Amino acid sequence: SQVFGVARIYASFNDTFVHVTDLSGKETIARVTGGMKVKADRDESSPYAAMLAAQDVAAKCKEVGITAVHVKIRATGGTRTKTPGPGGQAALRALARSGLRIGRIEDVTPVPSDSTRK
Amino acid sequence: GQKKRVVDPFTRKEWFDIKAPSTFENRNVGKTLVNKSTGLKSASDALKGRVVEVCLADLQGSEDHSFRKIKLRVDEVQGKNLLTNFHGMDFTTDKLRSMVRKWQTLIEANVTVKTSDDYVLRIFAIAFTRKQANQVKRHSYAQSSHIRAIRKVISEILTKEVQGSTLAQLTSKLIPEVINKEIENATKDIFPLQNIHVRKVKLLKQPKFDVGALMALHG
Amino acid sequence: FAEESSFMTLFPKYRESYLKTIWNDVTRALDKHNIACVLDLVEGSMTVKTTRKTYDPAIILKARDLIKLLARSVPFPQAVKILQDDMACDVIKIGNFVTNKERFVKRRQRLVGPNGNTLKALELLTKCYILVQGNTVSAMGPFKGLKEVRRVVEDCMKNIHPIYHIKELMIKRELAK
RNA sequence: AGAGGUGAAAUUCUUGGAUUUAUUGAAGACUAACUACUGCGAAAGCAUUUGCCAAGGACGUUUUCAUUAAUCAAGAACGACCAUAAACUAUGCCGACUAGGGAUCGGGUGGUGUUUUUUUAAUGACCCACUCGGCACCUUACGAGAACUGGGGGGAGUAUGGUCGCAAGGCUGAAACUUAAAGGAA
């Protein structure tokens, strides 16, 4: 009975990105990053900024008709930190608090598999 | 300077839904937005290169495929539906990270095979060495001649399980994990080898369209 | 709520006599957050599972960090500091920085320090908990501390000594206050 | 309509649409997890699969040659364009030398249980004893162990009528001129 999108939470250090797309991942339903909801340029990675961004993402998601979101959460990855930064828990918590049903949480960070350091 | 203004683009989107082929259980996987089918770049042309990456737990209904996400490529589109074909299969990264433990060897194989069509697949496999019951020593490593012999029998058995399957027969083959039991029964006179998996099936090149075969796959 | 999520790690054999003793405290610490968890000794695994009463979506990822920390052999009272929001894991990777084993083990022992002094001073200055283990450096802690300890560990695997970074941390603390 | 990045910023990219997402293609580098006090190499060093080329090691041997051997001064091999790090807290009693102990890697012999299996050719895994040889680890017993170079001799201090230097004055202006304007100080 649901309509499922996908969340594409990118929770790096220094920033977070909540970017709901459709089930293909091609067309985008309301990407708002964390650094635009509050702006002193150091508070952009914060749980508060991820909270604001995820809440208005879920507002536009219920506007377009999406009642439930598969969540795919990634870190900065590559040859770098590989840990979901401070915005990931808050973006997922605001995306669940603002009405959307949550399905299939999965870490999708790019594990580099013999990276290009030296 | 001056940037642009706004016109709401979710009035000119259309909610096509996606049908899964008959190789699975319950096959209405979701919906998709695409721009409305105006003349000069219709919607049915802006589709057809779209893959959806869905979970086999939903595509089979049972939860014991909670890993193993598969990919469906839109090929035909009619009746506000999307007619999808098997385009890939992966594991979730936390599955193989839940498999790898030290003091054992992982053997992995990958072959480039062609099915009974002119599809070519790169099909992978991973397999972890097991310590037996009544084994006292902690290691159970492989002796690397055993790794060559195991990788040889694995490459032979999955290049035999393809070329003797279609994509319908191969998706129907890797739904109930039965190539894994084939590998284990072929391997258990070299090393024990716990949790063989296939981990990845990659489409490389596809033959032609064949709309009648697509519609016969669906029903 | 959440439909179903489950994570699982698998631990080495020597940990089981410890995990069997601390397991009731993991079960209580997760049952206040409404997460089920099992300890499967016949394989040597630990799974965390979202139950029907789990109203927090992102708590299963912190339980995932908890079971993989108990596999990576941090203690339990230092391990259930991961279930609270201002904390996070990190695993800095140092195996792929240098060629010869002599230089590698001397730079890693330079990271641990004379009598553990460099490691304990870095733990104090960054408020983190660090384990130098094998050819990787695990850390728990706040995020400012995690970025600090990551650049310290990678700069110690390159040639610049970690006491220089510790002096810069003491300077930067006194300039931040 | 921001994105980098930072302790904060900044340089920088950005409505010619950055960052994020999806599909695709290329280029260079690397071979994560498995990765160990484990394996190999004379050392420097060596981790994707498969094939070929030669090589090396231990083991097995009721095979062959018959002293061909060990040691190191010398010498030989390995080790006009885009620019880069190295060491940095460390350790122990030495050799001609006795037994060992637990584990581990490679080979071999025996034992007789389970994984195996069968009339296509072989090739296993584990357990237990014995054994040979390796990288290590924990103990043991007993021995003269002597006949890319350049240097004064301890640690911690203390004192100075010697030698060699630095170094104080005191409002500037402003001195031959008791002299402006502006400033310091109170």
CB pair distance less than 8 Å for A105 and C90: no
List of chain C residues whose C-beta atoms are within 8 Å of the C-beta of residue A93? 56-58
Q: Is the CB of A46 under 7 A from strand D?
A: no
B61, B52 contact by CB (below 8 A): no
Backbone angles phi, psi at A105, to 5 degrees: -75, 130
CB contact A31 to C (< 8 Å): no
C1’ D75 / CA B173, Å: 71
Rounded to the nearest angstrom, the minimum Cα separation between B32 and chain A is 6
Q: Return d(Cα B155, Cα B141) in angstroms, integer.
A: 21
Question: b/e map of A47-63 (b: 16 or more CB within 10 Å)?
Answer: bebbbbbbbebbeebee
Rounded to the nearest angstrom, the minimum Cα separation between C10 and chain B is 6
If we measure between CA atoms, which residue out of B63, B74, B92 comes closest to residue B32? Answer: B74
* CA–CA–CA angle C23, C27, C31 (5° rounding): 170
Instruction: Return the DSSP state at A28.
Output: E
- Experimental resolution (Å): 3.4
B94, C7 contact by CB (below 8 A): yes
- Please report, for residues B131, B137, B138, the alpha-carbon distance to residue B134 in angstroms, rounded to integers and kept in the order given: 9, 9, 11
C1’ D46 / CA B100, Å: 24
Pairing of strands A28-33, A16-21: antiparallel
User: Residue A75 corresponds to which amino acid?
Assistant: A
The neighbouring-strand residues paired with B128 are B106, B194
If we measure between CA atoms, which residue out of A20, A30, A31, A10 comes closest to residue A78? Answer: A10
Mutual angle of helices B178-187 and B145-161, in 10-degree steps: 140
Query: Cβ–Cβ contacts within 10 Å for residue C124, how many?
Result: 11
List of chain B residues whose C-beta atoms are within 8 Å of the C-beta of residue C13? 138
List of chain A residues whose C-beta atoms are within 8 Å of the C-beta of residue C5? 104-105
Using CB atoms within 10 Å of the CB of residue C127, give its burial: 0 to 12 exposed, 13 to 18 middle, 19+ buried: middle
C1’ D164 / CA C39, Å: 82
CB pair distance less than 8 Å for C4 and B66: yes
CB pair distance less than 8 Å for A63 and B34: no
Q: What are the residue ranges spanned by the domains of chain B?
A: 11-219
Rounded to the nearest angstrom, the minimum Cα separation between A12 and chain B is 19
Q: Return d(Cα A82, Cα C90) in angstroms, integer.
A: 8
List of chain C residues whose C-beta atoms are within 8 Å of the C-beta of residue A105? 2, 5, 57-58, 60-61
Q: Write down which residues 42-101 in C have CB closer than 7 A to strand D.
A: 93, 95-96, 98-101
A31, A56 contact by CB (below 8 A): no
Q: How many domains does chain A have?
A: 1
DSSP-assigned letters across all residues of chain B: --------TTSSEEEEEEE--TTSSS-EEEEEEEE---SSS-HHHHSSS-EEEEEHHHHHSSGGGSS-EEEEEEEEEETTEEEEEEEEEE--HHHHHHH--SSS-EEEEEEEEE-SSS-EEEEEEEEE--PPTT--SS-----SHHHHHHHHHHHHHHHHHSSS--HHHHHHHHTTTHHHHHHHHHHTTT---EEEE--EEEEEE-----HHHHHHHH-
If we measure between CA atoms, which residue out of A15, A75, A21 comes closest to residue A47? Answer: A15
Question: b/e map of B155-167 (b: 16 or more CB within 10 Å)?
Answer: bebbbebbeebbb
C1’ D6 / CA A107, Å: 27
Residue A4 structural domain:
1-118
Alpha-carbon dihedral of residues A47, A49, A52, A58, nearest 10 degrees? -80
If we measure between CA atoms, which residue out of B76, B90, B84, B79 comes closest to residue B29? Answer: B84
Mutate to test the interface with C, among A16, A81, A108 (most CBs of C within 10 A): A81
